[PDB]
Write a protein that binds this DNA or RNA. Structure first.
Length: 437
RNA sequence: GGCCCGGGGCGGUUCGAUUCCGCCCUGGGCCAA
């Protein structure tokens, strides 16, 4: 149980055993041939080509090089044609552009079309850059593949490995650049402990400096940030995670944390114990991809949080869960019920013009003076958080994201109490309240 | 689809709004795939 002792056993969870590496080779072999018999210009990229794939995430990425002069349209049509005749099973996926996804000899395969180019400039879509990235990486990551694997396992185990919007963590390309830079997993970890929210890592210049944000400059483009979508808190959890590992290394850092489910009865008690208001917003899940969905959930949650805090309900944290069935926006406030009356700041006493207007407004309670200015008692339209969120949600649906909002407008309900405990959100709430044990 | 910056119009709220809550047009930048 010192770092070395532990990393020895970690390799055993991140590195693909012989039957997984093999099964991959036979795929590539066969996948190679099919392409050759159709005489197609391709190039394997991604972690498979660079043997940097994590044990159990075997996925081959085949990019088809196309003449610079071809139209995007030709690229997809011929790409669709090629992916089609070369895949046991084929399925049309989408991202910046449409591409084919399939399976060969039992393994995942992506068949992406892109332009054959030289010089990063003239890249028309992120996918054009992929070839350069791989080109810049192949010679430099050689002999450190397992260091990359250890770093991917770590991030994966602590729920921050992907860069898609559902994670906002460290992309795979970010992982290898880090190794190229620090030489190994441990060095990366040891140095990360001194990372701040202002750290900039210029792989190309082999330098580390201070910027205006966490920035890992792409060796292939000096203006692009590889860790651009790494959220601030996710960067925080990592720095802290390295700090801990280094203080007491454990094989537990590479093992996914167990769900740790709680009986609802217990959950209720804690909420009773916390004395806070806990409720969730339930609406149907828009039939869209996670990359559009999650950023919307974040928006919705945020807009409602801010409605709650400006409306003096003292919210503590927000959260959200997504299912096949519905989406849950969760909340916790310090105020279960506020008074109807509240005070409104009026003009200063010596402004006759405004004082008069401020008084022309007939009110139920008759304003008063305090510290040189007039004030007024006013009544609220709602006195509980839920009551407030039913109002805000019913009228502000349009500001909660294009999709999420359109779904909320057509349906939603506010759940709380026991009826809430039983919904598919128990885990999220435990994280939102730091329930421990 | 989401985030950043900027223009032109509006609505509501307020003694008072460029300034708070929001809506329509609209220019550029960026992110995930």
């Amino acid at each position: 149980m010192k770092v070395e002792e532990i990393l020895e056993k970690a390799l055993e969870l991140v590195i693909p055993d012989e039957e997984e590496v093999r099964k991959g080779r036979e795929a590539e072999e066969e996948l190679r041939r099919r392409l050759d018999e159709l005489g197609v210009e391709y190039v394997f990229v991604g972690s498979y080509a660079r043997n940097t794939w994590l044990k159990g995430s075997l996925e081959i990425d085949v990019f088809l090089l196309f003449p610079e002069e071809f139209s995007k349209e030709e690229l997809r049509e011929r790409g669709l044609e090629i992916g089609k005749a070369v895949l046991d099973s084929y399925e049309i996926r989408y991202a910046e552009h449409p591409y084919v996804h399939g399976v060969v000899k039992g393994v995942e395969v992506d068949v992406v079309p892109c332009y054959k180019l030289k010089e990063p400039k003239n890249i028309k879509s992120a996918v054009d850059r992929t070839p350069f990235h791989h080109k810049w990486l192949e010679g430099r990551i050689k002999g450190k593949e397992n260091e990359v694997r250890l770093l991917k396992g770590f991030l994966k185990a602590n729920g921050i490995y992907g860069a898609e919007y559902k994670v906002r963590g460290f992309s795979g390309y970010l992982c290898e650049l880090l190794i190229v830079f620090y030489g190994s997993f441990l060095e990366t970890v040891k140095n990360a402990r001194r990372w701040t929210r202002r750290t900039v890592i210029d792989v190309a210049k082999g330098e580390v400096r201070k910027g205006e944000e966490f920035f890992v400059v792409d060796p292939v483009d000096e203006k692009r940030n590889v860790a651009a979508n790494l959220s601030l808190d996710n960067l925080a959890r990592f720095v802290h995670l390295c700090r801990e590992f280094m203080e007491a290394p454990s094989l537990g850092f590479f093992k996914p944390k167990h769900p740790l489910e709680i009986e609802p009865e217990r959950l209720r008690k804690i909420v009773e114990e916390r004395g806070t208001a806990v409720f969730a917003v339930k609406f149907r899940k828009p039939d869209i991809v996670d990359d559009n969905l999650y950023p919307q959930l974040e928006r919705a949650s945020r807009k409602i949080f801010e409605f709650l805090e400006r409306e003096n309900f003292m919210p503590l944290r927000s959260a959200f869960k997504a299912s096949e069935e519905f989406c849950y926006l969760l909340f916790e406030c310090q105020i279960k019920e506020i008074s109807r009356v509240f005070r409104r700041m009026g003009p200063q006493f010596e402004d006759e013009r405004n004082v008069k207007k401020f008084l022309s407004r007939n009110r139920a309670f008759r304003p008063f003076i305090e510290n040189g200015r007039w004030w007024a008692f006013e009544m609220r339209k709602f006195t509980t958080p839920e009551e407030g969120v039913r109002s805000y949600a019913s009228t502000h649906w349009h500001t909660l994201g294009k999709n999420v909002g359109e779904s909320i407008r057509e349906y939603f309900e506010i759940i709380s109490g026991e009826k809430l405990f039983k919904e598919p959100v128990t885990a999220e709430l435990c994280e939102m309240m730091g329930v421990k044990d």
